[PDB]
Amino acid sequence: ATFEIVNRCSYTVWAAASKGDAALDAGGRQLNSGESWTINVEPGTNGGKIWARTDCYFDDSGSGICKTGDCGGLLRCKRFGRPPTTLAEFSLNQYGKDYIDISNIKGFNVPMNFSPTTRGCRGVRCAADIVGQCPAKLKAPGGGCNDACTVFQTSEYCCTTGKCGPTEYSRFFKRLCPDAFSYVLDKPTTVTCPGSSNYRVTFCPTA
Template identity: 40%
Template sequence: MDRRHLSSTFVFLLFLSFFSEVNSASFKIVNRCRHKIWPGLLSGANTPQLPTTGFLLNPGKSRTVTIPRSWSGRLWGRTLCGLDSTRKFVCLSGDCGSGQVECSGSGAKPPATLAEFTLNGAGGLDFYDVSLVDGYNLPMLIVAKGGKGGNCSATGCLLDLNGACPSELRVARKDGGGVGCRSACEAFGDPQYCCSGAFGTPDVCRPSTYSLFFKRACPRAYSYAYDDTTSTYTCASADYVIIFCPPPYSSQKLFGERKDGAVLPLVNKSMIYISSVHANGASLSGK
């Protein structure tokens, strides 16, 4: 191979590398929990799976994942994981059923708190949200960094709801400790909670007592299928920090208002749950 061909090959590879960097976003995934978590990532339909789809993240640690700008998908945290008697990797909450640390195209078994993204969507904007439609297992915060356009605001659910979960939705370990809070759709399968069948349109499917439990605690998170107005956020060309178990009070102080001017707190200050007080899940009123 002559020197001119080597030089042109090097320039081409350098261009590809630069083009790839320009057309990618970074997700910095941070574990602020006091225990290990195993983040899982799932690409949406017609979107290739990422090189990593699951990994261990120790307390206080972070990992940055490069994401294509055209990507859509979701990520979540798995907890209380290990090998079962058949040497398969399993988790008590958020398990993806792959039998491995990598989820390899499998999604979270509800209940699980989900961070959902569509990058470079309509108008070149990223669309992102934190969803409790499939239930809840961990506090989570999404923060957009270096973006433009849209409102680029933080969103999430900052409170630990497992201890306050209504008893009929509660998922617990054998020792009684809460590991998740199911959605009413999963718990009861009723179309009015699932927004299906005769309840399959936004004018008919309305918030329920159960979805309001989630909404009052976490005003910016999706609480049921048609909860779009206060739960979808947009930004352009941003990188994202996804924090598990963020400190609620510092986050509230830093990200108390949407950048588009709408007054909407990350935490409803009238509804800070204390697990030992609300262990039976009796309070659905927010008082």
């Protein structure tokens, strides 16, 4: 499956793509304002994620650091990124269908639209100014808006026991972005797409 990653932000971002234990395609690449990078994700990929990283610095070997979404200090991500990270999540060819969603469970750093480029289903989006409106206690000194689990480490915010409910913090993310997961047990906003669909992830879709 092809995923065209487009940076419509006025600032540079370092796109990342991983499934947790492996890097999807190159795993990561720099995207200056306006640039598009198309990656190929193998069919059947389960638990894949794409996100943006901001304020990065890498050397000649591809090692460095980013203020948001840093993945072990590597340009080419092999693991998931450090919160806060707005997440485009997907599982492909799962019993004949594809499943996509956007999640704020690990915080928010850059606005994003995640849509199919093929017929059969609609896209999801979270482009509200969550960083600007971020509650004081969730503001990440390094940039972005942290999720409550990351900040407070409680069973309720992290839903560790699998028995949690909405919170004042999750409701903030849900208010700003109704079409994205605001907490673990949030009402699903996952979209079902035809198996083997193709997609486009656009950072800062609202220009």
